[PDB]
Design a protein around this nucleic acid. Structure first.
Ligand SMILES: [Ca+2]
Ligand SMILES: [Mg+2]
Length: 430
DNA sequence: ATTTTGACGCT
């Protein structure tokens, strides 16, 4: 009752660039705009692997992970942009720099947590408080929310999508009590106004469109963002959670898409997030551990406390290459040459990072995979990173991995290497 | 033969 926490203390947004790599290429090449198109890395093997798909192309069934030749079977007019290749490998610099464009705009509005190259969480609590003080009890016009969906509405006693959107928004705004400045629903609504403004600024200043979710925590914000894509934003209120979760497969909630969510489903014999409310917190901890159990018990009620962390820059700078099937590295000189390629890209990115961000990496992590192992990484070893020098870094990585070679022969490498990975970590201010 | 990333938890 009066002491039951409701997880309504914050306003949190999750902003997600729509088909991001595709938009970067479409901004650069107008011929690709408003067309079925995809971004592909490499071209030799089956036309290349698709890593991003425009919504026009998704309408044909084109997906990420698809080979471009197969996507062309589904969508013969599919247009393709290739990821740059440098030093023998795919190079993602253009997309990292475009990401920085967007993150810097978002940071003008609020503290952001970089969640991935194309998405950030936004802590809007303070900004909402200030905006509420500016408004002076003035009601919020639907005109301030031209691309917002209110999940769960309309309901109760038009056949077009925008008409439904407006009907639900009208019902929401008509019910709102704008005089109570501590109303969580009002606070979410002002948050959505700010996010409309943020998304307008991003589009104006970069050309990039995005979707967003607005709710009271990160997990609900993330889930809300996916409900109406592309180029739209969705408000998920605390009150919407019971109905939303009543048919929501558990795997849709962030962190439950893998083995843990599968174990929740199997051990508990349930399918939907709302079905979790019928277990005690101790029951959930008994099956899934103290932390996961407490998290699940609160999350299925719409409550989560993970903070938006003030971190706009990545914590690691890495580069890796797979060597599948017959291309697996079988000679020492091969391994060394590719370590050098990876190390040279790493040095370039590290020097740029040091100049832009006043920090230096202090640890070099080296990871390899050996042929036959199902795990993504077979072995990981670290060494000191004391100089931004590609030859030193490649030599050191070889030093820490060279004992993995089972071969009795000197120049040969066995078992062959199917993956190399260099990662700079443990940054310190400089 | 998806590939190339990135953050975080466990022990
Ligand atoms: Ca995205
Ligand atoms: Mg994303």
């Amino acid at each position: 009752g009066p002491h039951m926490a409701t997880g309504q203390d914050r306003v949190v947004a999750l902003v997600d660039m729509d088909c991001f790599f595709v938009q970067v290429e479409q901004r650069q090449n107008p011929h690709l705009r408003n067309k079925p198109c995809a971004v592909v890395q490499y071209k030799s093997w089956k036309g290349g692997g698709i890593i991003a798909v425009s919504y026009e192309a998704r309408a044909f069934g084109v997906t990420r992970s698809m080979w471009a030749d197969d996507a062309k079977k589904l969508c013969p007019d599919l247009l393709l942009a290739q990821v740059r290749e440098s030093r023998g490998k795919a190079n993602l610099t253009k997309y990292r720099e475009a990401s920085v464009e967007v993150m810097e705009i978002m940071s003008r509005f609020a503290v952001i947590e970089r969640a991935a190259i194309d998405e950030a969480y936004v802590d809007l609590t303070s900004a909402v408080q200030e905006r509420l003080q500016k408004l002076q009890g003035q009601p919020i016009s639907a005109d301030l929310l031209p691309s917002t969906y209110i999940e769960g509405l309309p309901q109760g006693p038009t056949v077009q999508k925008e008409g439904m959107r407006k009907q639900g928004l009208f019902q929401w705004l008509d019910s709102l009590q704008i005089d109570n400045l501590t109303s969580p629903d009002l606070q979410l609504t002002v948050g959505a106004v700010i996010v409309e403004e943020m998304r307008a600024a991003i589009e104006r200043e970069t050309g990039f469109q995005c979707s967003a979710g607005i709710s009271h925590n990160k997990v609900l914000a993330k889930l809300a963002c996916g409900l109406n894509k592309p180029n739209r934003q969705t408000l998920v209120s605390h009150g919407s959670v019971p109905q939303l979760f009543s048919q929501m497969p558990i795997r849709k909630i962030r962190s439950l898409g893998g083995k843990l969510g599968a174990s929740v489903i199997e051990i508990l014999g349930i399918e939907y997030m709302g079905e979790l409310t019928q277990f005690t917190e101790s029951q959930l901890q008994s099956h899934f551990g103290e932390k996961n159990g407490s998290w699940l018990y609160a999350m299925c009620r719409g409550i989560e406390h993970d903070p938006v962390k003030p971190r706009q820059l990545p914590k690691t700078i890495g580069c890796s290459k797979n060597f599948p099937g017959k291309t697996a590295l079988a000679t020492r000189e091969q391994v060394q040459w590719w370590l050098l390629q990876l190390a040279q890209e790493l040095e370039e990115r590290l020097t740029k990072d040091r100049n832009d961000n006043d920090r230096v990496a202090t640890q070099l992590v080296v990871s390899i995979r050996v042929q036959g192992d199902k795990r993504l990484s077979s072995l990981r070893r670290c060494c000191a990173l004391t100089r931004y020098d590609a030859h030193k870094m490649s030599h050191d990585a070889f030093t820490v991995i060279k004992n993995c070679n089972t071969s009795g022969i000197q120049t040969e490498w066995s078992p062959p290497l199917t993956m190399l990975f260099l990662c700079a970590t443990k940054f310190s201010a400089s």
